[model samples]
Target: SEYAKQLGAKLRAIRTQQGLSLHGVEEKSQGRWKAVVVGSYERGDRAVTVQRLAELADFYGVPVQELLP
Candidate 1:
């Protein structure tokens, strides 16, 4: 969906701003965040649930609202 893609773009923007690659996220999280799974999210191949989104926001030290479109 276009909306999902937009969200993914935002997510990617945040990620890049933090200087984290897809695999970097995995390494930083020590496998808690998988590169493939996060790549899927960034590619809009998968949707993020609200709870998981919150967790991600916390992980990135950002407000969850910022992650929303």
Candidate 2:
């Protein structure tokens, strides 16, 4: 749970830095990343799968290895 929150914090920062709102992220991905699901991940209520994490890192143009704390 704690680790998830830390990773999710990074995700939130990346998304916000790119000027994407929760809905915007979903819209940008054409619903590939739902706002609700991502929000839960950000709040540490959900765990992001490895594949999904990679996809998100790619979507945000960040290096996958550097995403976590």
lDDT of each: 0.87, 0.90
Total clashes in model 2, counting residue pairs 3 or more apart in sequence or in different chains: 0
lDDT, residue 7, model 1: 85
lDDT tens digits by residue: candidate 2, 1-69: 889989889889899999999999999999899999999888889999999989999999999877786
Q: Per-residue lDDT of 1-69 in model 1, one digit per residue for the tens?
A: 887888888788888899999889999998998989887887889988989889988988998899788
Q: List pairs with backbone clashes in candidate 1.
A: none
Question: Could you tell me every candidate's TM-score relative to the true structure?
Answer: 0.95, 0.93
Where in model 1 is the C-alpha error above 4 Å? none
Count of backbone collisions in candidate 1: 0
List runs of model 2 lying over 4 Å from the truth: none
Best by TM-score: 1
- For candidate 2, the C-alpha RMSD (Å) to the true structure equals 0.8
| TM-score of model 2 vs. true structure | 0.93
